[PDB]
C-alpha cells in the first residue's frame, strides 16, 4: 500500500518543478535577441576530402593542436589523419569490426575505441618501436559502448548502452565511479570546458547532468520528444545543445533548468546525428539524415547555410579547438573538411 | 627543415596505403552475416557447431569466407544497434517454434526499417519437430491464437514434402504464408526473403545460407546493370 503515496509524491514534486520553472521564466531568448544584427548568408566549401576508409564512419574527434584527427569505421581500422596534408599518420587494425566510437586524448598520447563488444580499448601512440598495440582493455560494461571521452591520461569516461555511465582509470582496469539513473540507451556525451561536469543524452528524451567528483546527477532537463542522439556543451560551459530523431535542435541552460530555444524547419524531418558548436557559439552545426548538414544561428534560430557534400547520411562532425575548420563524416567512407 | 619530415610522411602514407589495399583485398573476399532471433529458438545449437558483446564465427564453404556475427549479449532494445548491420550480405533469422506474434512483429520492424531496406534476410523455421508434436498432441490450438488457420488452404500447388502428418504441413505453410504476407506487403523490390524449413540437427543449414547468399549476390549484380 506504499506505491500510491510514492506516486503522489513524485507527481507533486513534478508539479513543483513545473511551477518553479514557470516562475523563473519571464521572456524567451528570441525576444531579447532580435535587436542584434543577423549573421547573414555564409558558405564554406570542402577544402580537403579524405579517402581510404572501407566502411561507414561513425565517430571522430579533433585533436587539441588542430593537426591530427582519428576516425573509426566498420572495417576494424583506426586512422589518424593529418588535416593539412591528407596524410595517414597511423593505421591501427582493430580486433573488433563493429567499433561505434573513438576519442583523442588531450595530450595526444592515447586513443580510445568502443563498439558492439562492451570493451573500451586504449592504444599507445607515443611509443616508437615499430609496433602500436592496445595498452589497456576496459571490461565490465553490459550494454554496447556508444561514446567515450578522455578526461586525462589516467581517467576516461565511457557511456554504455545499459543506461549506465562509468568513470574508468587506466593502468588499473576497474571502475572508479558509476553514474546511474537513466532509463534509455546513452547515445552521446560531452565534457565541460573545466573538465568537472558532463552531460549525457539517453534514449528517454532527456539530458542529465552528472558530477564526476562525487558521482550523482545534479539537474534533469527533459524537453524533448524522442531519443537524443548527440549532445555538446556551449563554449561558455553554462549551456549545451541536443539533437534528437524528431528533427529538432534544442539549447538548454545549466542555470535556468529549462530549454531556451528550438531549432527546426517544416520542410525537413531527419534525425540529427551530431551537434557541435563554433568558437563563439553563434553557429550551431548539426548533422541530419537527409545527406547534408545545416548551420543554424544559435541566437536567432535562423538557418545561415547548407553543407551538402556527402553522398550518404552524416553520422559524425566536430569543430576543432581553435575553430579554424569543421570536419563532418558520413556513411560513404568519405571524410571532408569544411572551412 | 621540412623536406625530411615531408619525405617521411610520404613514405609512411605509402606504406599505410599498401597495407590498406591488402586489407581491402582481404576484406572484400568475405561476406558478413548477422544471426538474429528470439530466445529459445535453437540458434545456440548452430552457434556451438562453429560475457562479450559479439561472438565471431569464422566458417568457410566452397572456398568462400563467411563471417557470422551473433549479437546476443546486447540489451533487448535493438533500435540503436540494428542500424550497424546495413552492409551485411544477409541477416539470418531464427524463429522459435504467443511466441510467434513477437517474432512476426520483430520481422515486420526489421523489414520496413529505413536503414535495413537494402539488406535481405534469411528465414529459418527452427524446431519443426516441436511444431509437429504440438499439433499432433492436441493439447494446444492455433485457432485461438490465429483466427485464420481453419479457412486457410494448404498450397498443394507447391508443397513437395516427404511423408508426414498433412496437418503439420498445413501449419508450416501457414506460418510461411504469414511471414510472406508481411514480407511482400510493403516490399519495393530492393530486398527479399528466403524462407527455409530446418530442424535443430540439420547439417545442410550452411549449404542453404550459401545458396541464399549466392542468390542475393546474383540479384544485386543483375540490378547493378539495370537488368532487374
Amino acid at each position, epitope marked *: 500500500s506504499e506505491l500510491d503515496q510514492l506516486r503522489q509524491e513524485a507527481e507533486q514534486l513534478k508539479n513543483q518543478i513545473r511551477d518553479a520553472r514557470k516562475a523563473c521564466a519571464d521572456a524567451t531568448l528570441s525576444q531579447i535577441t532580435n535587436n542584434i544584427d543577423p549573421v547573414g548568408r555564409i558558405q564554406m566549401r570542402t577544402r580537403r576530402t579524405l579517402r581510404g576508409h572501407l566502411a561507414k564512419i561513425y565517430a571522430m574527434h579533433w585533436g587539441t593542436d588542430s593537426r591530427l584527427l582519428v576516425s573509426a569505421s566498420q572495417d576494424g581500422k583506426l586512422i589518424i589523419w593529418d588535416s593539412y596534408t591528407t596524410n595517414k599518420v597511423h593505421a591501427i587494425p582493430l580486433r573488433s569490426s563493429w567499433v561505434m566510437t573513438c576519442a583523442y586524448a588531450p595530450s595526444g598520447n592515447y586513443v580510445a575505441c568502443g563498439g558492439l563488444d562492451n570493451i573500451c580499448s586504449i592504444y599507445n601512440l607515443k611509443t616508437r618501436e615499430g609496433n602500436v598495440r592496445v595498452s589497456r582493455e576496459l571490461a565490465g560494461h553490459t550494454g554496447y559502448l556508444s561514446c567515450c571521452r578522455f578526461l586525462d591520461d589516467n581517467q576516461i569516461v565511457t557511456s554504455s548502452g545499459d543506461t549506465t555511465c562509468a568513470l574508468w582509470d587506466i593502468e588499473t582496469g576497474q571502475q572508479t565511479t558509476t553514474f546511474t539513473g537513466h532509463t534509455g540507451d546513452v547515445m552521446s556525451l560531452s565534457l565541460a570546458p573545466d573538465t568537472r561536469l558532463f552531460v549525457s543524452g539517453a534514449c528517454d528524451a532527456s539530458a542529465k547532468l552528472w558530477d564526476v567528483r562525487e558521482g550523482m546527477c545534479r539537474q534533469t532537463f527533459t524537453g524533448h520528444e524522442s531519443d537524443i542522439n548527440a549532445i555538446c556543451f556551449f563554449p561558455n560551459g553554462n549551456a549545451f545543445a541536443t539533437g534528437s*530523431d524528431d528533427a529538432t535542435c534544442r539549447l538548454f541552460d545549466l542555470r535556468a533548468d529549462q530549454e531556451l530555444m528550438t531549432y527546426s524547419h517544416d520542410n525537413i524531418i531527419c534525425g540529427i546525428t551530431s551537434v557541435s558548436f563554433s568558437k563563439s557559439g553563434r553557429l550551431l552545426l548539426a548533422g541530419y539524415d537527409d545527406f547534408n548538414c545545416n548551420v543554424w544561428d544559435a541566437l536567432k534560430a535562423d538557418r545561415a547555410g547548407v553543407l551538402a557534400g556527402h553522398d550518404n547520411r552524416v553520422s559524425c562532425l566536430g569543430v576543432t579547438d581553435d575553430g579554424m575548420a569543421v570536419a563532418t563524416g558520413s556513411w560513404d567512407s568519405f571524410l571532408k573538411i569544411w572551412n | 627543415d621540412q623536406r625530411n619530415e615531408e619525405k617521411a610522411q610520404r613514405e609512411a602514407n605509402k606504406k599505410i596505403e599498401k597495407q590498406l589495399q591488402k586489407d581491402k583485398q582481404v576484406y572484400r573476399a568475405t561476406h558478413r552475416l548477422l544471426l538474429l532471433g528470439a530466445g529459445e529458438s535453437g540458434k545456440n545449437t548452430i552457434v556451438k557447431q562453429m560475457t562479450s558483446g559479439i561472438f565471431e564465427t569464422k566458417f568457410q564453404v566452397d572456398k568462400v569466407n563467411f563471417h557470422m556475427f551473433d549479437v546476443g549479449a546486447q540489451r533487448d532494445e535493438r533500435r540503436k544497434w540494428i542500424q550497424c548491420f546495413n552492409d551485411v550480405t544477409a541477416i539470418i533469422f531464427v524463429v522459435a517454434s504467443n511466441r510467434l506474434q513477437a517474432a512476426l512483429k520483430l520481422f515486420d520492424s526489421i523489414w520496413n526499417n529505413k536503414w535495413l531496406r537494402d539488406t535481405s534476410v534469411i528465414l529459418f523455421l527452427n524446431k519443426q519437430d516441436l511444431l509437429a508434436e504440438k499439433v499432433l498432441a492436441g493439447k494446444s490450438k492455433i485457432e485461438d491464437y490465429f483466427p485464420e488457420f481453419a479457412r486457410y488452404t494448404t498450397p498443394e500447388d507447391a508443397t513437395p514434402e516427404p511423408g508426414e502428418d498433412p496437418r503439420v504441413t498445413r501449419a508450416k505453410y501457414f506460418i510461411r504464408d504469414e511471414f510472406l504476407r508481411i514480407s511482400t506487403a510493403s516490399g519495393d523490390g530492393r530486398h527479399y526473403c528466403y524462407p527455409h524449413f530446418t530442424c535443430s540437427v540439420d547439417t545442410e543449414n550452411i549449404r542453404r545460407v550459401f545458396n541464399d547468399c549466392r542468390d542475393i549476390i546474383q540479384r544485386m549484380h543483375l540490378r547493378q546493370y539495370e537488368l532487374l
Partner: nanobody
Amino acid sequence: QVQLQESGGGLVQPGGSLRLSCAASGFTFSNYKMNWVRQAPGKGLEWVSDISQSGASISYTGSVKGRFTISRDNAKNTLYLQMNSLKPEDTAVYYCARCPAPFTRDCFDVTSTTYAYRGQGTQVTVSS
C-alpha cells in the same frame, strides 16, 4: 516530457464491456504511431494492437482479432481501445506505448521490458 496515463479497468463479470482512454501530452500526437501492450500476470510481455498515423492501417494480434476495436484522433490527442467479449484468459495489465520515431513505420522495441515512453498502465481484470 511525454506522459501517458491510463483510465478505466475494474473488477467486472466476464463478457462485459469496459473502456480505456489515454490522453497524450508532452508531444505531438499526429506524427507518432501508437501500439497497445498487455502484461499477462505470471508471464512475459505481449503485444495487443497498433494503429497507423491518422487511422490508416489497423492490425491486431490473433488472440484478439475480430473482437477488439481501436480508435485514435489527432485533434483530441487521445487513444481509445474498445473492451468487449471479456474472458478470464484476457486478464492482463494494458499499457499505452508510443512509437520511438516520427514518420516511421518500423517502430522497434515496443515489447522491450524497460521502455521510457510506455504509459503507466491500469489493471484490467475480470472475475466473479
